[PDB]
Design a protein around this ligand. Structure first.
Ligand SMILES: C[C@H]1O[C@H](O[C@H]2[C@H](O)[C@@H](O)[C@@H](O)O[C@@H]2CO)[C@H](O)[C@@H](O)[C@@H]1N[C@H]1C=C(CO)[C@@H](O[C@H]2O[C@H](CO)[C@@H](O[C@H]3O[C@H](C)[C@@H](N[C@H]4C=C(CO)[C@@H](O)[C@H](O)[C@H]4O)[C@H](O)[C@H]3O)[C@H](O)[C@H]2O)[C@H](O)[C@H]1O
Ligand SMILES: *[C@H]1O[C@H](CO)[C@@H](O[C@H]2O[C@H](CO)[C@@H](O)[C@H](O)[C@H]2O)[C@H](O)[C@H]1O
Ligand SMILES: [Ca+2]
Ligand SMILES: [Cl-]
Ligand SMILES: [Cl-]
Ligand SMILES: [Cl-]
Ligand SMILES: [Cl-]
Length: 496
């Protein structure tokens, strides 16, 4: 469950948050395949309740009403087409599996659902699965309200309702089997693995019991005997009762400490400095690298949901975000996930974005297609960070340097740092309020290399900055603190 099952040599996934299946299929073919991306995390593909107040928020997709593959992203045929087309160009599909719960316990009964299935939340009836009251944890929960009152009590976190959502009785083989049947349908379609939503809210052994029922991956695209990649969403910043490590036996775990601490460092908040990153990884108290799924931001915390707070860097802070994403994609720690977002109208009231519910770009609730501009950006308010040169080229960097060790660290004792990956790549950052002008050991063979942050190698030449590396492996890096992108990255495949 720990191996990502990407094509050999492909080292990242992108979250194409709220994208439609046909757009992802096209994106695999025209972009992600050719640009070396390993895979796509998709939004929940199972039927959800329609939320009309507020009007179609993103988060309605975390309120399941059946396991039918029919959502605002598309129907089952479109989903299958996507998985087929993406796998056929070497880009894997990872599903966001919403398995801890069904919809809100206070929701109305009816067929206000994305495929038209009936449900009666008050009576715990989901006939399209089917589930009945017997399949939920209302009895087992010991709080007066039926909700989680204290994260200090692991029983309540797992057995009570998370924000009022009906909590499935994951101890029951019936429930485990209903979930496995859904996940196995997806595996047989060709999905490579799963993000297990809300894993903190399930017992590790209940998750294990579900995972033990799972098929091997489809041999049209994977070697025989391949197990699905599992990454469990567990928020554990270091000060609550439930630990990430409780989940290591099932697969990887999201390391939320990563983006929280990196954001603080890059923002230079709380006295933090980039020079402190020399021992990034387990030296910062993180989980083992071979258990970690890492990311700068995710779909929750880029809009103030989940955890990390204001330190989280996002596309709204584009300059610093590119620096953080670049550091992450260069550093060997973890398996990397890059976010791909949409814009929304933020409205901060006493520090809270009261528009944090706004759903994807839409015409009257119908999700807009992703249009591609001549300059390779996207229209219709899709941000497409994974198309930014500075991020795409660092996705390629990580593939180029795969397997090479952290090497040749340098810092100025403040916020200028550099390091390499064996003899195959080197990166240099200036996050101080003054000039960087230093001659550094890169670990690379002598030659002239294209800086892949400012440009590209195009045939015989570089379209941006060029770095001349001496025969001894040293090079000067000159980066102004007023630079648009105050970091430079070179690697073996950017050499002229
Ligand atoms: C969002 C994450 O929440 C939890 O994280 C905790 C940390 O665990 C903790 O250490 C600390 O950092 O606080 C964090 C935030 O509280 C959780 O551990 C983590 O898994 C979460 N991310 C996962 C999980 C979910 C669930 O699938 C996603 O949550 C999102 O979707 C929710 C469902 O739509 C959305 O909630 C909306 O709907 C519910 C129903 C509503 N509650 C009202 C309704 C009912 C009855 O119907 C009443 O009984 C309730 O009392 C009412 O409040 C919410 O108000 C509404 O917003 C939620 O906001 C949204 O984040 C998440 O996307 C996943 O990644
Ligand atoms: C300076 O560096 C340290 C790591 O050397 C950062 O501390 C991190 O590591 C410890 C390890 O347990 C953890 O307890 C801290 O919360 C984490 O930040 C400091 O923050 C840097 O100031
Ligand atoms: Ca639960
Ligand atoms: Cl249970
Ligand atoms: Cl357990
Ligand atoms: Cl097999
Ligand atoms: Cl996540």
């Amino acid at each position: 469950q720990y191996a990502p099952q990407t094509q050999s040599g492909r080292t990242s996934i992108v979250h194409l948050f709220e994208w439609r299946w046909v757009d992802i299929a096209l994106e695999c073919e025209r972009y992600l395949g050719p640009k070396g991306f390993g895979g796509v995390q998709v939004s929940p593909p199972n039927e959800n309740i329609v939320v009309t107040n507020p009007s179609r928020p993103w988060w309605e997709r975390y309120q399941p009403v059946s396991y039918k593959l029919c959502t605002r992203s598309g129907n089952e045929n479109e989903f299958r087409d996507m998985v087929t087309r993406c796998n056929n160009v070497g880009v894997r599909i990872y599903v966001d599996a919403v398995i801890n719960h069904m919809c809100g316990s206070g929701a109305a009964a009816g067929t206000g659902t994305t495929c038209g299935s009936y449900c009666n939340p008050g009576n715990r009836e989901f006939p399209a699965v089917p589930y009945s009251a017997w399949d939920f944890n209302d009895g087992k929960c010991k709080t007066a309200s039926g909700g989680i009152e204290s994260y200090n009590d692991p029983y309540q976190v797992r057995d009570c309702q998370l924000v009022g959502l009906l909590d499935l009785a994951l101890e029951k083989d019936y429930v485990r089997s209903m979930i496995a049947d859904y996940l196995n349908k997806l595996i047989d379609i060709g999905v490579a693995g799963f993000r297990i939503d809300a894993s903190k809210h399930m017992w590790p052994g209940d998750i294990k019991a579900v995972l033990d029922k799972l098929h091997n991956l489809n041999t049209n695209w994977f070697p025989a005997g391949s197990r699905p990649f599992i990454f469990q969403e567990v928020i554990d910043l270091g000060g609550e009762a439930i630990k990430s490590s409780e989940y290591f036996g099932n697969g990887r775990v999201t390391e939320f400490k990563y983006g929280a601490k990196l954001g603080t460092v890059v923002r230079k908040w709380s006295g933090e400095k980039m020079s402190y990153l020399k021992n990034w990884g387990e030296g910062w108290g993180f989980m083992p690298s071979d258990r970690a799924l890492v990311f700068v931001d995710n779909h929750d915390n880029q809009r103030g949901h989940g955890a990390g707070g204001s330190s989280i860097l996002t596309f709204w802070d584009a300059r610093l975000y590119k620096i953080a994403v670049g550091f992450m994609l260069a550093h060997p720690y973890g398996f990397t996930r890059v976010m791909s977002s949409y814009r929304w109208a933020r409205n901060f009231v006493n520090g809270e974005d009261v528009n944090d519910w706004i759903g994807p770009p839409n015409n009257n609730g119908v999700i807009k297609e992703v249009t591609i501009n001549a300059d390779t950006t996207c229209g219709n308010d899709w941000v497409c960070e994974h198309r930014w040169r500075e991020i795409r080229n660092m996705v390629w960097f990580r593939n180029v340097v795969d397997g090479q060790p952290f090497a040749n660290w340098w810092d100025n004792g403040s916020n200028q740092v550099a390091f390499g990956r064996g003899n195959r790549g080197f990166i240099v950052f200036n996050n101080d309020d003054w000039q960087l002008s230093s001659t550094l050991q890169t670990g690379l063979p002598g030659g002239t290399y294209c800086d892949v942050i400012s440009g590209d190698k195009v045939g015989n030449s570089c379209t941006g900055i060029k770095v001349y590396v001496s025969s001894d492996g040293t090079a000067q890096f000159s980066i102004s603190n007023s630079a648009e992108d105050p970091f430079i990255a070179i690697h073996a495949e950017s050499k002229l």
